[PDB]
């Protein structure tokens, strides 16, 4: 089916670096230069207050919609990733259901400004106080802290490309039918990432990357806060939440 489902040579690993970085540039959603340029565009006290005055359900809706948009880009990334379309449909769905949110959280560090602790949201930069109406302050602060810790690594676009490819192709995901196929693909993508860090003298970050339990904790918290919201506003979720968002976080 695919060359990266078997042991890959150094030249084939070099070819895998290029390919993963190409798939990412093509599906990265927002260009880093545009995100960096927008950093001086920060929501005012008045705009912050307006966001805080929004209803909990209006805020959950807007956030679910912006997350779905990001996820759609991660689906395109997966589809362009070498070996992913060669896996069976069950496995592709298993992989994206467990890892789409994890990839989005990692990608988000590009949109996070460590200098003033703000995130790009709806055209401007705002702090965690912008999301106060959601009623999930622990989750928001955990996401900001995570983005802060990734920003301290000074991740390049190519590093984000190779790391997120790895977050997605995880052969430990429960429900994978072609486990050995995913393991070999995971191994080659690990080699591709580690090769690129070796080549750029960036191996010092290996020990600084978050544990898998960190991204799993964040995704578990997201799922738990959505269940709490759903109990409060069931018809909002049923009528106004994106179908893709519901397929991934509330079982349909």
């Amino acid at each position: 089916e695919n060359l990266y489902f078997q042991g890959a040579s150094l030249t084939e690993i070099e070819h895998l670096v290029q390919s993963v970085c190409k798939s990412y540039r093509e599906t990265c959603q927002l260009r880093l230069e545009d995100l960096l340029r927008q950093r001086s565009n920060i929501f005012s006290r008045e705009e912050v207050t307006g966001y805080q005055r929004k209803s909990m359900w209006e805020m959950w809706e807007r956030c679910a919609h912006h997350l779905t948009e990001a996820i759609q880009y991660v689906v395109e990334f997966a589809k362009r990733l070498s070996g992913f379309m060669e896996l069976c449909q069950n496995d592709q769905i298993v992989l994206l259901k467990a890892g789409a949110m994890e990839v989005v959280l990692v990608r988000m560090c590009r949109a996070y400004n460590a200098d003033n602790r703000t995130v790009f949201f709806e055209g401007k930069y705002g702090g965690m106080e912008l999301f106060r109406a959601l009623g999930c302050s622990e989750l928001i602060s955990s996401i900001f802290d995570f983005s802060h810790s990734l920003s301290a690594l000074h991740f390049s676009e190519d590093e984000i490309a190779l790391y997120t490819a790895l977050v997605l192709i995880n052969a430990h995901r429960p429900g994978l039918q072609e486990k050995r196929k995913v393991e070999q693909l995971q191994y080659n993508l690990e080699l591709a990432f580690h090769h690129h860090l070796c080549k750029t003298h960036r191996q010092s970050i290996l020990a600084k990357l978050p544990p898998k339990g960190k991204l799993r904790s964040l995704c578990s918290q997201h799922v738990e806060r959505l269940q709490i919201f759903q109990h409060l506003h069931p018809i909002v979720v049923q009528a106004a939440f994106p179908p893709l968002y519901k397929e991934l976080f509330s079982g349909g």
Binding site: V75, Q92, I93, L96, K246, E247, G252
Partner: peptide
């Protein structure tokens, strides 16, 4: 019972 992933995965 929403299933959108299979549609996105099949769309070329």
């Amino acid at each position: 019972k929403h299933k959108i992933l299979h549609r996105l995965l099949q769309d070329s």
